[PDB]
Design a protein around this ligand. Structure first.
Ligand SMILES: O=c1oc2cc(O)ccc2c2oc3cc(O)ccc3c12
Length: 346
């Protein structure tokens, strides 16, 4: 017996379809489970609409992190009001039977489900452009000085379609987010979307979300993760395959530089060599983004020959924006305001 019979043995509320809360919410179904707790679909009888309710684990560490999430969401909707910056809206939060509950607007499926529905052929570059433009606008809103919110977990699963037919999207799940002045975790971002500065144990800021976005946008058009590392060493090596060795002025400040790279006696950094006799990674910078996108060969799978918005010129603009987003240097990596001025969006 936990929490008078309402919790399982892992601090999760035992969800029962049809249960009514506070004469208002009718719990309909489980829609997701995570380390923070659970997310259920529920009908809000008072407002006559569906909602998604995040039920935080009945346990202090998860309660405290979600209390930060609530504060960040409340800060955001104090600066948004009209919900025009593609951020999920917190409708309400409350305690119910020793669980912090976060009520969000109901949304459609996430960008990974969309990819799986294309059987990982990817979506068109035109739809990728629309998603990119809305995400850069969302990041510009996060970069508002009073906010300065780092999401820290941008990935296709955390971007939801508003309606299954429309192209409008929203960023969800600020459960790991922090303001720039209040960073507290070091092992952050899901691995495929993790920035070099996080991999390198360096201090991080809002530029790490732009790195995730660049990775996300390529995957949305190709159907496959750009950097699908199985662990931290593999992830950096897949990054290096495409982008080359990071600038020396970065690695010379990098607490974990020697987890991946070696300094040669003459100051120039190289990769740590793979173990005798196993196939090497492709040499640094030789897995060209140019060929991943299929810039000159009809895009991914050669499927886009003659398609509008997929000319070589369009692919070259997209490639350029991606490389600006995948800059190793978080000071020079393109910023939301300037990504919005990029010719990819013209
Ligand atoms: O915040 C979230 O975190 C999650 C974490 C998971 O592991 C799975 C699903 C969710 C999830 O689905 C939603 C649907 C909405 O309409 C709004 C918010 C969310 C939301």
């Amino acid at each position: 017996v936990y929490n008078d019979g309402y919790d399982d043995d892992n601090y999760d509320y035992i969800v029962k379809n049809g249960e009514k809360w506070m004469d208002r919410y009718e719990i309909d179904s489980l829609i997701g489970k995570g380390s923070f707790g659970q997310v259920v679909k529920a009908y809000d009888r008072v407002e006559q609409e569906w909602v998604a309710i995040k039920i935080i684990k009945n346990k202090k560490a998860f309660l405290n992190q979600a209390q930060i999430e609530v504060r960040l969401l409340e800060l955001m909707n104090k600066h948004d009001t009209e919900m025009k910056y593609y951020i999920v809206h917190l409708k309400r939060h409350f305690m119910f039977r020793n669980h912090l509950c976060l009520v969000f607007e109901m949304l459609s499926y996430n960008l990974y489900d969309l990819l799986r529905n294309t059987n990982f052929r990817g979506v068109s570059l035109n739809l990728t452009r629309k998603f990119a433009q809305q995400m850069c606008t969302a990041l510009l809103f996060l970069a508002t000085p009073e906010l300065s919110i780092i999401h820290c977990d941008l990935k296709p699963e955390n971007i939801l379609l508003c309606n299954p037919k429309r192209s409008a999207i929203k960023i969800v799940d600020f459960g790991s987010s922090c303001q720039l002045g209040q960073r507290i975790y070091q092992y952050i971002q899901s691995r495929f979307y993790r920035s070099p500065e996080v991999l390198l144990g360096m201090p991080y800021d809002l530029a790490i979300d732009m790195w995730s976005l660049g990775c996300i946008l390529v995957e949305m058009h190709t159907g496959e993760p750009l950097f699908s590392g199985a662990n931290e060493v593999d992830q950096m090596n897949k990054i290096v395959e495409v982008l080359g060795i990071p600038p020396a002025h970065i690695l010379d400040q990098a607490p974990k530089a020697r987890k991946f790279f070696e300094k040669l006696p003459d100051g120039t950094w190289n990769l740590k060599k793979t173990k005798d006799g196993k196939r090497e990674y492709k040499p640094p910078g030789t897995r060209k983004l140019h060929n991943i996108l299929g810039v000159e060969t009809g895009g991914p799978g050669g499927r886009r020959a003659g398609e509008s918005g997929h000319t070589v010129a369009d692919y070259l603009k997209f490639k350029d924006l991606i490389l600006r987003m995948l800059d190793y240097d978080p000071k020079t990596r393109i910023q939301p305001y300037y990504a919005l001025q990029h010719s990819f969006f013209k």
